[PDB]
Amino acid sequence: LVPVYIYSPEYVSMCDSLAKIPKRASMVHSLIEAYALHKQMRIVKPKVASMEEMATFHTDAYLQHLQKVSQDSIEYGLGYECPATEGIFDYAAAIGGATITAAQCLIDGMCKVAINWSGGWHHAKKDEASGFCYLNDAVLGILRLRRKFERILYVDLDLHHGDGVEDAFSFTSKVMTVSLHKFSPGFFPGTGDVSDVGLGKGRYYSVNVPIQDGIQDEKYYQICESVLKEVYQAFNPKAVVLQLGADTIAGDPMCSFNMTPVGIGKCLKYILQWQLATLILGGGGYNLANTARCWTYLTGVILGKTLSSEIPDHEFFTAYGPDYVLEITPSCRPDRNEPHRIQQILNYIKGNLKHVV
Numbered sequence: 001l002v003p004v005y006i007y008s009p010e011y012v013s014m015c016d017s018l019a020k021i022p023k024r025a026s027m028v029h030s031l032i033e034a035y036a037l038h039k040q041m042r043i044v045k046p047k048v049a050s051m052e053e054m055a056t057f058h059t060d061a062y063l064q065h066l067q068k069v070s071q072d073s074i075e076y077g078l079g080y081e082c083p084a085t086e087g088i089f090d091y092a093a094a095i096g097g098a099t100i101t102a103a104q105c106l107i108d109g110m111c112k113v114a115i116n117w118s119g120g121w122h123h124a125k126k127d128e129a130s131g132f133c134y135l136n137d138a139v140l141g142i143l144r145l146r147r148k149f150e151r152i153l154y155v156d157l158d159l160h161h162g163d164g165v166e167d168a169f170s171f172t173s174k175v176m177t178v179s180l181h182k183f184s185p186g187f188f189p190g191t192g193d194v195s196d197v198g199l200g201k202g203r204y205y206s207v208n209v210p211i212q213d214g215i216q217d218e219k220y221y222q223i224c225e226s227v228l229k230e231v232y233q234a235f236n237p238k239a240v241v242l243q244l245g246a247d248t249i250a251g252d253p254m255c256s257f258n259m260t261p262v263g264i265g266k267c268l269k270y271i272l273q274w275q276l277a278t279l280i281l282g283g284g285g286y287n288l289a290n291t292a293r294c295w296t297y298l299t300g301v302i303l304g305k306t307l308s309s310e311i312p313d314h315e316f317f318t319a320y321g322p323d324y325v326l327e328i329t330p331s332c333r334p335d336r337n338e339p340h341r342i343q344q345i346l347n348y349i350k351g352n353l354k355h356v357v
């Protein structure tokens with residue numbers, strides 16, 4: 001009946017090790033700990049993933065080359081946006097096992113919600129790293145939930161299209177991917193238009209909501225609550241894996257959307273009401289303080305509590321300047337979403353789910 005918090009000091013430093021987001025894991029955890037929220041959660045320790053577990057999705061050829069480089073790289077998407085340097089394999093197996101360990105607790109009824117903020121490594125392909133993703137925990141997690149639940153619902157709210165996890169299941173009707181991501185020519189990963197719905201018997205079991213810059217809480221929530229509505233009808237999920245990349249929150253260097261944790265929180269709330277087993281994953285998020293703010297606040301809405309507007313003193317208190325509060329203010333800039341286009345989409349989707357048996 002109580003939330004599982006996947007954590008272990010050995011795991012958090014493992015994470016901070018990634019150059020792309022140094023010390024983010026600590027800041028996130030630390031801030032949550034400073035809010036004394038880990039005292040209201042079953043702190044479960046993460047279990048590293050075994051080769052036969054990472055193999056349930058990633059090809060052995062990839063997992064080998066990944067194991068070696070960690071020991072021609074361009075072969076498996078390794079190089080620039082995927083630093084083929086130190087021992088990443090370990091790092092990857094840790095996060096993977098973290099999400100699988102989370103998935104497990106969900107089946108063993110050990111909880112109703114399992115959290116692993118260091119996860120949501122959604123761009124990864126079966127045999128190719130991508131967008132700084134070397135392993136796909138989200139997928140490895142859904143595949144594990146498949147042991148019980150016959151129907152999983154994946155909701156990616158990261159700023160980018162969860163292309164990786166969608167391709168993985170783009171052919172089955174057993175799993176449904178729903179991604180709300182900024183979509184525009186020349187913005188990673190490029191895919192994810194609304195016309196994108198899947199292939200074969202997976203046709204219509206993949207949802208994509210292309211959005212534009214400047215979108216803000218109310219507008220965003222109404223689009224999400226809406227889509228999730230039709231989706232909860234048509235698909236009727238058994239479990240839910242939710243990606244919450246905070247690189248949509250005002251102030252992200254990404255500077256695209258204009259959300260604040262509250263807006264995301266309402267979406268989160270709506271989903272937590274279906275009272276289904278839910279696996280919580282993080283994602284993007286490159287304004288460390290803001291991300292920690294977002295996810296701590298979100299851990300709060302998961303625990304039903306309302307957090308103190310003031311930022312408790314902890315190891316990273318200094319990074320919350322200049323105001324030192326938990327609230328994030330939207331930016332004074334245009335919301336380039338035309339209300340008519342949002343509808344053409346909501347429709348196209350509203351009418352595409354129509355086909356779900």
Ligand SMILES: CN(C)c1ccc(C(=O)NCCCCCCC(=O)NO)cc1
Pocket residue numbers: 081123131132158159160161188245247283284285
């Ligand atoms: C030094 N600097 C400011 C940058 C260097 C590289 C990129 C990039 O590769 N961008 C394309 C891939 C972005 C992947 C983001 C991962 C994510 O949040 N996925 O959801 C961008 C900025």
Ligand SMILES: [K+]
Pocket residue numbers: 169170171172173175176177198202205206
């Ligand atoms: K699918």
Ligand SMILES: [K+]
Pocket residue numbers: 156157158159160161162179180181
């Ligand atoms: K998304």
Ligand SMILES: [Zn+2]
Pocket residue numbers: 158159160245247283284285
């Ligand atoms: Zn992202």
